[model samples]
Target chain A: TTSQKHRDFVAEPMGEKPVGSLAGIGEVLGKKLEERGFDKAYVVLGQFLVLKKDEDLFREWLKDTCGANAKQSRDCFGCLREWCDAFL
Target chain B: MTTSQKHRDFVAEPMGEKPVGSLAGIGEVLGKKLEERGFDKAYVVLGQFLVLKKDEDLFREWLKDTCGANAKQSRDCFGCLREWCDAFL
Candidate 1:
């Protein structure tokens, strides 16, 4: 699941693409985050990597930042955590 | 041999278990300095790479600041990062 997830994402290089390309950033929240300067998927990935995949902290931060509900935050956090585990 | 020597080597595959000194332009002196500064392994440098979001300028500046690298040293280091990312990520 993890490596396949990474391959699907990392298969193509990221070139300033929109943040929504990241696994859990659906259109609605993606636009919200874009307004807040997280325009690129890499920027969000940067934040996640900097936090070193601390699940609780990352989830809480995402929720606080964008008002993500529990399920949404969980999916997003899991996606990022899995991405880092496989790639970084 | 241009940067090809270093680039080809770094791009071949994952850095799975390389030494800190394996990075281009990071000789014994720079490697020892990095080790002394608590970056004893390549993974530590990879951590910084992720933190910088793979920005070339930021990573080069970090290299210069941390190890007193001149332009050539920074360039070599930057090349390694680019090549590594191209092949692996």
Candidate 2:
């Protein structure tokens, strides 16, 4: 199941929230992302927009970029998708 | 100057559906190149900026490579985007 991180991230502007705050992006994945330049949640959101928010593409990118598993990637994708709906 | 007015206009409000040239530092020539490469809209370029996490160096390099922007142009574009994010992102 998706975590409250999804709800919380989607509910706000995500101005400068850390990547770790996203659902499915735990400390391990967050650290990996930060190491690779995706330090902020907005950065990931940028990728989502770049990919046009395609679920399959975003999932694949997450897996390849950070080794996120299927469920983890899906939760993360859903979080951003919903956030874009609310804010973008 | 045109630069000040353009930057002020871009940062003034949401950049909904504006062309890439609408962004600061992106003149007609650079805008043409970016549009050819599918960065027709301001938001697409904004995606590139955000994906780079607002890094000035990386963004400047990308702008140069993507659309042949020179040092000053890239810096102006980066500064505007950075300020836009600070105000609205």
Candidate 3:
């Protein structure tokens, strides 16, 4: 859970990095996100917050949105959780 | 200005349904600009900021492009939203 990727993501306020910059976002998932206007990492953050930061809802949304598997959804959810703690 | 009463007010609590003009940098003119463009509420503006991942440059640029907010205005607005998330996001 504390992978360098996740650590790096939670380390600072996210800039304008692409969606693929998130820990669980692979090229395929990234492209899917892009197709839905979440090309930017922050746009995804908007979705997370709009979901009220609820892990279940967010993970479910991610699965439904881009078919992110459970592990992938968990990574993104945990990453956002820590990022919020770090800078939020 | 550094932080005004307005900025203080905005960052102090949840934005709820406060109008877009309630944001620190936005006044009547800028508020109207964003309001006409689906930013009628403060939360909508926060949506834009979060969508930009709270990047100062990008968010400020967006505000300027959308509403003619100057550097100081956008900066004030950015700081306000950034801090709001720190406390409440």
DockQ, every prediction = 0.23, 0.60, 0.23
lDDT of each: 0.69, 0.87, 0.83
lDDT of 2 by residue, A31-77 (tens): 99998989999999898877766799899999999999998898899
Candidate 3 CAPRI assessment class? incorrect
Query: Which runs of model 2 end up more than 4 angstroms from their true locations?
Result: A1-3, B1-3
Candidate 1 vs candidate 3: the lDDT winner is 3
Per-candidate TM-scores read 0.65, 0.85, 0.61
All candidates' chain B TM-scores are 0.87, 0.95, 0.95
Q: Candidate 2's error at B30, in angstroms?
A: 1.0
Instruction: Report the candidate with higher lDDT, 2 versus 3.
Output: 2
**lDDT by residue (tens digit), candidate 1, B1-89:** 56757656766766644677878878888889877776666655765665576777898899888887788877887788667766655
- Report lDDT (Cα) of residue A20, candidate 2: 94
Higher-TM-score candidate of 2 and 3? 2
Q: Report the lDDT of model 1 for residue B46.
A: 62
User: Of the candidates numbered 1 and 2, which has the greater TM-score value?
Assistant: 2
Question: Candidates 1 and 2: which is better by lDDT?
Answer: 2
Q: How well is each residue in A9-85 modelled by candidate 3, as lDDT tens digits?
A: 88876766788888899999999989987888778888776565779999999999999999999999899877766
Q: Write the residue-wise lDDT of candidate 2 on B1-89 in tens digits.
A: 54578899988876766889988899999999999998888878888999987889999999999999999899889988887887777
Q: In candidate 3, which residue ranges exceed 4 Å CA deviation?
A: B8-45, B52-89
